[PDB]
Design a protein around this ligand. Structure first.
Ligand SMILES: NC(=O)c1ccc[n+]([C@@H]2O[C@H](COP(=O)([O-])OP(=O)(O)OC[C@H]3O[C@@H](n4cnc5c(N)ncnc54)[C@H](O)[C@@H]3O)[C@@H](O)[C@H]2O)c1
Ligand SMILES: NC(=O)c1ccc[n+]([C@@H]2O[C@H](COP(=O)([O-])OP(=O)(O)OC[C@H]3O[C@@H](n4cnc5c(N)ncnc54)[C@H](O)[C@@H]3O)[C@@H](O)[C@H]2O)c1
Ligand SMILES: NC(=O)c1ccc[n+]([C@@H]2O[C@H](COP(=O)([O-])OP(=O)(O)OC[C@H]3O[C@@H](n4cnc5c(N)ncnc54)[C@H](O)[C@@H]3O)[C@@H](O)[C@H]2O)c1
Ligand SMILES: NC(=O)c1ccc[n+]([C@@H]2O[C@H](COP(=O)([O-])OP(=O)(O)OC[C@H]3O[C@@H](n4cnc5c(N)ncnc54)[C@H](O)[C@@H]3O)[C@@H](O)[C@H]2O)c1
Ligand SMILES: Oc1cc(Cl)ccc1Oc1ccc(Cl)cc1Cl
Ligand SMILES: Oc1cc(Cl)ccc1Oc1ccc(Cl)cc1Cl
Ligand SMILES: Oc1cc(Cl)ccc1Oc1ccc(Cl)cc1Cl
Ligand SMILES: Oc1cc(Cl)ccc1Oc1ccc(Cl)cc1Cl
Lengths: 255, 255, 255, 255
């Protein structure tokens, strides 16, 4: 495949419906060696099964809230890999009331801090931590959503963080571009995942996109996965600082 | 003027070259009643002179880092005004190494938190706090910069925060829109202010914009001031969730 | 008013519900001297009444399809005015099948040519013809629609033309910017006008915008009129190459 | 490869330096069957060599200015293929004075018409003509430039046309989306091609992009070729109505 010999670290793989899971499957198919992260002592079993499922024994704990675990992540990976080719940032979180009902109702300084801490800062944080062992043609990938660019019901505080996330894609691309590293994001359409359950009336969003998107259909973690695999490969060596919509074209219309 | 009888609160007035100062002058000229905020026990004298200069006795301390001062601000304002017609958010801050040289060099979880805390969160924070005494045709205004949408040298972490700020403009517009309140931002071109001094090689930016902007000239706090006065007025009752460029058109070209 | 002593030529005034009519009323109120154009020998009477209604005797024929009438327009205006301060381009047209049903169904080389000829080319064309008699602080204004940036049902070929129109705003801004002339567009929300009648299911669009816009209301020619007067005035001397949304914020949300 | 069994028609292949040539090479590598078009009785020899070079005997004349040749193109192709999987629109033209010096100097109704006729209309025109023989998972691709979104020196009239082209990408995506057809564009960075020679001071642009792009390097027809191959493949089945930048990230920065 077009990822033969590429070593890729994936975050955010929580279940077999996770976006990170879709990307992992596509990357393995295209011939990459994978490494995974998990959050919390408990999930170690579930993620190891997933890793083994993709032919990997490399799993590392990393709660992006903790600077310690982040530095430890790449110190540990370095004992197995001396060169990192790909990094998949598929991580997001906000207190649930900050993504429910009215934007102001759920707004608190703490909710704001957490949402941006975990959903935005973590990307460039991981990048900075990985820099020393990044190959010269390395590719960094993150996941964003249309809510960053336009106001979407219930998305609220998460929207602000995503806007920051996308801005970081650009500033990262400039900082790491000299070395030859590319940084991109995929703005994915709605997908029924674990995290998606916390967004109020997510079903309304799925129905609406299926009805109004140009392709009249929702996207899959396979379609997002393939797009991700492409951006991580040398096929996209001309692409950086890009926010690529994988949403059946929904962003481009007025529903 | 087109602001006769409007009561407007302005933050960020620090010196006579401040953007907030430009907006203040324009609003007064168009007939508004002004109120001001200052940071730190010390600046009370300097801001009181400015307030008097605009025919106001209303100055209140407000460090947007402190929830207490924010709640106290509108509690105090309520003893003078029972109705707030306008709110000007002209506030920004990041640790200086976070806006110097390389994006990653200046990136730390703390620098990130501070920048977003003060430059982004504070806007919707003030909005939420002012909501109870906001008129039905009230208008909220904030200041942003091209660095949110494109990667600008040295702007770094501030770019991420501004992106979040612009996103909050949209989500605020939806939340307060029902009541009839409008929320907008002005994306101002570079202006030699106090804060601007902290941006490395700011002079290079001024020269470049003057040379490459369609109008071949930099903007003034009077031009930003007038635009702000417009957006705060009923003349712009059809405008909300808008990021208006006041930058001599620089954003629309490739220099 | 903030347009005292400004001489402004308005195209597109067809009925008292026209956007151009809204702009004219606002401009007169703020103290401008107005001049008007009409299409076809017949409408001369109706437009002269309107002109008189705004205290003007200056009406000139100008079918923007004809280079002759365009050059003649400013030759004639020059006999009354030696200096033009403002130009309002409120003109649009496409064959009706090109803005009905399916995009491809209504697509023909001729329909394409006409739509772009009248709706896009005419703006920079009028600009070029007016250049010799334009003041140094002159302001040019055109009207666009969200359909240029996103696909809107039935707008079809008109969307392509508007996209070109908005692009011309930018290139015009660069070309005339040196002299000191500003070029802008207002992206207006849906308004029940004569032309609007030709857009299939225009009523559905009005209802949708009223329901989903942040301000939960449609815009008026008065609100667009005021925005236009602002952009035409020195109050907006810092603004050029801008496409300003006057649509109750509709563009910024997902409905 | 990921294009095994796909039948793709390519326009715009003029020299081994053409963008279409880069795309052709990448598609063949990934396993597609190719067909080519040429303009003018004369170039038939040169294009047949190129086609043979990619293992194809299918070349058809098509001057997109002529409705006749366009209809004849797909009538002829239908005798060899009963199903078209891909269409590559790599065509552009404007009278040379329309892309030299000042925007207004080169502006004439005729120059405007031609530029939009050949560079914008031709895309949806070809699409409509190909519709009857398009497969349900077909993918259409066109080439655009940053000049559509921002004012670039000398690009002038071409910028307007590209803006229209990108708008057509969106309306096309909606019209053909129901059937399952995807429509996308690649916004390519500057590449030294035949057409590029007609843009005044093209060398200045190449140097500037190489110096200021995040990757500090210009792009190749191979990099654009790969991106194009991706968008034409099922790997990108989640992507439509997208304008993908392949420009080393240049668009995302301020140089
Ligand atoms: N699911 C969708 O419809 C959709 C659409 C667009 C964008 N996205 C974005 O895609 C990304 C991945 O979400 P998903 O939908 O694949 O979901 P998912 O819920 O299956 O996984 C989200 C992951 O985030 C991780 N995470 C949360 N807080 C963390 C922390 N403090 N430290 C480390 N990891 C943490 C979880 O462990 C989990 O693996 C998120 O940024 C989400 O906003 C999702
Ligand atoms: N100066 C420019 O060229 C320029 C360009 C675009 C945008 N902006 C934005 O305009 C706004 C005004 O900045 P300016 O350049 O006019 O500068 P200025 O330095 O005169 O004012 C900035 C203000 O921020 C205030 N501030 C900082 N930390 C604060 C805190 N914790 N609590 C409350 N207030 C705090 C300061 O007291 C000061 O009054 C900022 O948001 C800035 O990003 C400025
Ligand atoms: N009404 C809306 O909802 C809306 C929304 C967005 C944009 N617009 C834009 O507003 C502008 C004016 O539309 P309106 O709604 O005020 O309409 P209106 O229907 O009352 O007027 C249309 C105008 O087209 C002009 N016109 C047509 N062919 C012409 C030609 N060959 N030469 C000169 N003038 C010609 C006429 O003078 C007429 O006044 C158009 O560019 C339209 O696209 C309208
Ligand atoms: N080369 C660049 O730097 C660059 C960058 C971005 C976008 N583009 C776009 O890419 C496309 C191809 O440009 P290129 O640089 O690969 O160039 P190229 O000059 O080698 O090819 C341009 C093609 O236009 C075609 N063409 C011209 N007039 C035509 C007509 N009347 N009918 C049909 N076809 C006609 C010719 O077949 C020619 O091969 C154009 O749309 C151009 O705007 C080019
Ligand atoms: O960004 C998302 C967008 C959609 Cl449409 C669905 C799920 C998303 O992902 C999240 C949603 C809420 C929280 Cl709290 C965390 C995450 Cl990761
Ligand atoms: O945002 C700005 C943009 C420009 Cl071009 C110039 C000055 C700006 O204002 C600031 C810059 C840096 C910091 Cl830390 C704080 C502020 Cl208020
Ligand atoms: O552009 C418009 C957009 C809207 Cl929502 C309503 C009216 C518009 O104006 C026109 C619409 C169609 C044609 Cl043929 C001509 C014109 Cl002037
Ligand atoms: O769009 C382009 C952009 C660049 Cl940077 C270089 C070449 C381009 O393509 C053209 C430019 C001018 C003409 Cl007349 C024809 C074509 Cl095909």
């Amino acid at each position: 495949g077009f990822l033969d010999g590429k070593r890729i670290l994936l975050t955010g793989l929580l279940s077999n419906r996770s976006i990170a899971y879709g990307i992992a499957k596509a990357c393995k198919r295209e011939g990459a060696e994978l490494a995974f992260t998990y959050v919390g002592d408990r999930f170690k079993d579930r993620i190891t099964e997933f890793a083994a499922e993709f032919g990997s024994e490399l799993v590392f704990p990393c709660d992006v809230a903790d600077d310690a675990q982040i530095d430890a992540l790449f110190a540990s990976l370095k004992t197995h890999w001396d060169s990192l080719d790909g990094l998949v940032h598929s991580i997001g979180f906000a207190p649930r009331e900050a993504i429910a009902g009215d934007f102001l109702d759920g707004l608190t300084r703490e909710n704001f801090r957490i949402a941006h801490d975990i959903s935005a800062y973590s990307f460039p944080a991981l990048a900075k931590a990985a820099l020393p062992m990044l190959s010269d043609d390395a590719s960094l990938l993150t996941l964003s959503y249309l809510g960053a660019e336009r106001a979407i019901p219930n998305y609220n505080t998460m929207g602000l963080a995503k806007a920051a996330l996308e801005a970081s894609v650009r500033y990262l691309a400039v900082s790491l571009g000299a070395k030859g590293v590319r940084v991109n994001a995929i703005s994915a359409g709605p997908i029924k995942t674990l995290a998606a359950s916390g967004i109020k009336s997510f079903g309304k969003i799925l129905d609406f996109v299926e009805s109004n998107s140009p392709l009249k259909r929702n996207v899959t973690i396979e379609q997002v996965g393939n797009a991700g695999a492409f951006l991580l490969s040398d096929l996209a060596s001309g692409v950086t600082a890009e926010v690529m919509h994988v949403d059946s074209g929904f962003n481009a219309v007025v529903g």
